């Protein structure tokens, strides 16, 4: 008889948080930004095309020096490119071909990748022996791992498919902080600019927020109808945009604890595969499954232009650490740098 | 050129990297991918062990070297995750190898898992990631089926069976028909085999089935199907 009281107490608390959040809402973001000028139609163009991959590209991640980038595809090879001169700085043959995520360390020395093997492998690039050799692999997950993020050079958060993000220690190979609390398979995660608290999205339309220091969940957001599979913080760290499987991105806020705007057109009916921000945050960038990316005005809620030029869907999207250019890696084995 | 002495060696390194990428791409174009998937305790472990003993946590990939051609059979059954999200990894596999056990009718939530394997089979082959692939279907445990059908009955657990109460041939061809007429609505050949615990050569069957798959794709390309 206690489980009935606990479930009804939980639903009462959900109602209390909902109507207390409703009284927290003064207005909407569409109401405030009616006094600012729009950006107008922008025309970003392809500057480089990076034809090195054979299978479909699943994930890319820029370098912190805004020049190199790592790409991962289903042929079983990470390749590290110099995006200025389009040369391939490195080619890393993987142990498992089914790689669904990759990440480049902000110290530059390390790289990591993972996928359907349930293992997160970590390679040491800058080596005295010449080749890119695997430093160590992190094996503590049961489902596939869907995202990797270096926070500094010795610890990495790995979202997985067992409704569990984690936090590892590469010097020992064991995890230190298991972030249990999701109910759907965790699809994406985004680290903060100050890098002390990350956000996570899963297969339950819920974008739960955590801190890396203690280990507790902080807040929990729910404004989506279907599966959310992309997430990205704001440039300061007080907001984050969310891209879900029903052609909707929406911007949640950390202190206001609500959504502020949502992004949808009627002809756009296919889900978002990746989302990212600019350095100023005026433009959201969303890579859909109608093969085109969109630059959304993050204040006036309309789209500031399209990006076409991929024959297949845009499975990964990334903006540099200084905002000079935009990489789109897609299923037609091509990356495209845009500005 | 206006490249440096250091920059030209970077372009030569990039071209050697290109050389190794193409020499690996036209090596991974050679072996044939087979998506094996089978649930409900269908004997997948002894199935793979049988194939590998007659032949010479995470996802597993098994190699095969028959008639100087090479297969990669990807087994994925150690996933506690949603298959709606990682199945687009196999948008062009050559064939889906299903494995259903013959005996798991009248095996029970309250539902018979033969109906659950029917639902899994339908929801896999109705995905849009499997147009150019075929469905190589396996039915395992023949002897357990014939013992269970000389012992028990089938007409009460499946009402649509109108056949002899001690029959095994018409029973297994009825449930093979039941698997076939899920109707992937584009008409396409679904190959089938009746294996057992001690079936020696079913690697020969999957060889002939992927051969007929590739040949059927070529014939429909040349309009002489």
């Amino acid at each position: 008889s206690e489980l009935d009281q606990l479930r009804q107490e939980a639903e009462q608390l959900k109602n209390q948080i909902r109507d207390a959040r409703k009284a927290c809402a003064d207005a909407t973001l569409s109401q405030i930004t009616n006094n600012i000028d729009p950006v107008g139609r922008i025309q970003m163009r392809t500057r480089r095309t990076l034809r090195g991959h054979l299978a479909k590209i699943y994930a890319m991640h820029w370098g912190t020096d805004s020049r190199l980038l790592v790409s991962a595809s289903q042929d079983g090879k990470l390749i590290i490119w110099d995006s200025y001169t389009t040369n391939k700085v490195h080619a890393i043959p993987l142990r498992s071909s089914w790689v669904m995520t990759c990440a480049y360390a902000p110290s530059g020395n390390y790289v990591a990748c993972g996928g359907l093997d349930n293992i997160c492998s970590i390679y040491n690039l800058k080596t005295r022996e010449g080749n890119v050799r695997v430093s160590r692999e992190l094996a503590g997950h049961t489902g596939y791992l869907s995202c990797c993020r270096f926070l500094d050079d010795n610890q990495i958060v790995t979202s997985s498919g067992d409704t569990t993000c984690a936090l590892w220690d590469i010097e020992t190979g064991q995890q230190t902080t298991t972030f249990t609390g999701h109910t759907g398979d965790v699809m994406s995660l985004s680290l903060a600019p100050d890098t002390r608290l990350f956000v996570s999205g899963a297969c339950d339309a819920s974008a739960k927020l955590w801190d890396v220091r203690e280990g507790m969940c902080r807040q929990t957001f729910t404004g989506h109808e279907s599966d959310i599979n992309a997430i990205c913080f704001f440039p300061n760290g007080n907001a984050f945009a969310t891209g879900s499987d029903d052609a909707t991105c929406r911007l949640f806020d950390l202190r206001a604890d609500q959504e502020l705007m949502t992004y949808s057109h009627d002809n756009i009916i296919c889900g978002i595969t990746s989302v990212s921000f600019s350095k100023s945050g005026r433009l959201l960038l969303a890579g859909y499954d109608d093969f085109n990316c969109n630059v959304w005005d993050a204040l006036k809620a309309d789209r500031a232009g399209v990006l076409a030029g991929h024959d297949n869907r845009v499975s990964c999207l990334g903006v540099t650490d200084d905002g000079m250019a935009v990489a789109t890696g897609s299923w037609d084995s091509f990356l495209k740098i845009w500005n | 050129c206006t490249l440096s002495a250091e920059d030209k060696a970077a372009v030569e390194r990039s071209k050697m990297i290109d050389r190794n990428l193409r020499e690996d791409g036209e090596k991974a174009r050679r072996e044939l991918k087979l998506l094996l998937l089978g649930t409900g305790e269908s004997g997948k472990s002894t199935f793979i062990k049988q194939m590998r003993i007659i032949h010479g946590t995470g996802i597993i990939e098994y190699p095969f070297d028959l008639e100087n051609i090479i297969f990669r059979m990807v087994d994925v059954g150690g996933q506690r995750s949603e298959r709606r999200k990682w199945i687009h990894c196999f948008e062009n596999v050559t064939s889906i190898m299903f494995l259903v056990a013959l005996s798991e009718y009248d095996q029970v939530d309250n539902e018979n898992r033969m109906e659950e394997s029917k639902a899994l089979f339908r929801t896999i082959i109705t995905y849009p990631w499997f147009q150019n692939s075929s469905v190589i279907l396996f039915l395992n445990k023949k002897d357990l089926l014939e013992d269970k059908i000389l012992y028990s009955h089938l007409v009460d657990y499946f009402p649509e069976f109108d056949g002899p109460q001690r029959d095994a041939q018409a029973a297994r061809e009825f449930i093979l028909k039941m698997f076939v007429d899920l109707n992937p609505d584009s008409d396409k050949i679904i190959y089938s085999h009746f294996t057992c615990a001690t079936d020696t050569e079913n690697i020969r069957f999957v060889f002939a089935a992927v051969k007929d798959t590739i040949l059927q794709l070529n014939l429909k390309e040349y309009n002489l199907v």
Partner: single-chain antibody
Amino acid sequence: DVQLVESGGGLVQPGGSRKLSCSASGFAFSSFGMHWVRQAPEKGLEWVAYISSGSGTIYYADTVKGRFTISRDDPKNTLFLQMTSLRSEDTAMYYCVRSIYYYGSSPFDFWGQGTTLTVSSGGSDIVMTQATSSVPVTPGESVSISCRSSKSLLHSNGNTYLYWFLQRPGQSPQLLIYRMSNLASGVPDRFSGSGSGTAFTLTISRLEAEDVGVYYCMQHLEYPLTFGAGTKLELK
């Protein structure tokens, strides 16, 4: 760890021929470009040959452009240099030095021990000069070594292709800094090189008795790769 050992020295007859072989043990040999340099037994060191990764591109110094030949063996993991028309200006100590070129690598990072070929009977390039040959300083003082070029080493991409090498007395040279700003992995962080166009200064702060030796500037803007004359830092 990394090992580069060469054989094929000694004493031979002038005018004849001689082969030379540095075997590499401890790294991925097929991915490294290789160089042969040589040092006159009382003068500084000069560059003689370079072979690329996979033997695609071969460059010779114009002194020995035609009577020298270079080759490698990536499975058997050796690097051969064969020398015909053996003069007495080829009297030197021969060093085998690996070098890899991607974005942000450290060429000339490891140098072999060297053989010695002792025998007896600078046109259309950048010459790297330095007009000081002995700076003896006590430990505990900032020492600035300079080196002058003929043309601006600053290329269009922004890099300045100046390399500094230390040589302790009695062993192989060591790469200190590369592209005149970036320190090698293994050197103490008291060295600091800087400059612009033609001004090129290596500054050592808080010196001790481990930084005593000869200092060589080196250019990489174009071929041939021409060294500097040297600068010795002694004790007191």
